[model samples]
Target: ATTADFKNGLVLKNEGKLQQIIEFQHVKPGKGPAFVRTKLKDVVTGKTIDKTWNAGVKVETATVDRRDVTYLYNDGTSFIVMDDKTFEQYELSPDAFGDAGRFLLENMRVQVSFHEGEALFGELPVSVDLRVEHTDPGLQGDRSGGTKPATLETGAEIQVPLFIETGNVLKVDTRDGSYLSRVNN
Candidate 1:
């Protein structure tokens, strides 16, 4: 592939290592030719670097394998996942999933990306519905835009509207743990 084909989430071998393009920009200086500047994250180390490529330069893309897996449980040290088809269990550290782990619930299905059978990252659904475990009480007729902190069933804390209460289910964005709306059940 060439620099012209650079895109977000594109994984390629750069500097003898696999890196994914997290962000890219095409720049054309008024006095020079065009080039592609990119922010690449090392798949294995999770380190990020900025690189610039001349337009039309050839780049080798890396083929990553992704699979659907079911969340099992966290065994204190590592989080467990089971293969959807083979039921094979795999244990990964919290760093493997990072913030995505907070949204994981038992039996929830998510995509796990792998490079050479090593798990690199995990992806969760854009939004999740979680039950509120605890929150402050709402005053009578206090339906303004005020917000309060709430704990969800998954043990993740997020800011929710003041009207929310314990036992209420809320729709939350997994990407940033933002409260979306109160769910009916």
Candidate 2:
């Protein structure tokens, strides 16, 4: 495929590695040649890089079969997940998932992308509502908007506003574990 057929969120392979086009833009300088700028995210290693090239360059496509999978429970070492369509169970390592496992809830259905025949990373929702397990309380009437480290029910740590207390459920960003908003009930 050529850069003219580039699309954001499309996966392609270069140098025998899979990379996704996170951002694709074409710019023409007033004095120079027209260039295509793209941000490539490595599928397996989770590394991102920004590079630009000629708009007519050719590239190869990759087969990333992304599908939803139901997550079972961890079997002491690896997490067991069942394919939603095939109903076949497979063991996925927590290391490959990284923060995805931190925000994953039991019996949750997550999306995973397979390159050849193995899962790369399991994706979670942009944010999840989780109960606050432990966090120090702030001083009375101190509405200065200060933040403190709050331990979520999943044992993940995130900084929440001072008003946030134990037993409160908060919306947390799954990507970076940042506090988003408070969850009612």
Candidate 3:
């Protein structure tokens, strides 16, 4: 393929390395031969790079396959996941699951990207619910405008709704840490 078909998720061999396109933009003020600016990341190394190419240039495309996997848990250095097709477990290091690192929960389902036989990356839901570890008891008569801090199961703290309390699983929009609401058990 060439720069014309480049988009997010397209893996291309660039500079003798497998690079997945994170994003790309084409510009042509009706001058020069037109060109493309791209943001790419290493498939297995997780290193990111930016490259520019002239329009219509050809590049070798790498076939990256993604499959749904269930996350069992993490063991400090790696995330444990299971393949749905065979139910086999795999220890995927941070490089393969880093994007979902800070927002992951046990037993959750997500995608693991693969290239040939190597696990390269993963994806996640934009809004996810995480249980609250602790928060001050919000009583009646408190102003709705008032919000307070709460610690998630991950041990990261964030401001939450005024009525929030301990033991409640909260729904979140990871894009900016927004709470959708208290999730049902």
Candidate achieving the largest lDDT: 1
Tell me, by TM-score, which candidate is best. Answer: 1
lDDT of 1 by residue, 1-185 (tens): 89888889899988788899999999989788998899999876688999999988999998899999988888998889998998999887777766767988888888889877888887778888889989989655776567889999988999988888899989999989999998773
For residues 60-139, could you state the per-residue lDDT of candidate 2 as single tens digits?
Answer: 88777888899888888998899999999998877656666787778877888898787877887787788899999754
lDDT of 3: 0.81
Report per-prediction Cα RMSD to one decimal: 2.0, 2.5, 2.4
Question: lDDT (CA) for every model shown?
Answer: 0.86, 0.84, 0.81
Say which prediction, candidate 1 or candidate 2, comes out ahead on TM-score.
Answer: 1
What TM-score would each prediction reach against the true structure? Answer: 0.89, 0.83, 0.85
Model 1, TM vs. native: 0.89
Off by over 4 Å in 2: 29-33, 138-144
Candidate 3 worst ten-residue window by lDDT: 94-103
TM-score of candidate 2 on Cα atoms, chains taken together: 0.83
Sort all candidates by lDDT, best to worst: 1, 2, 3
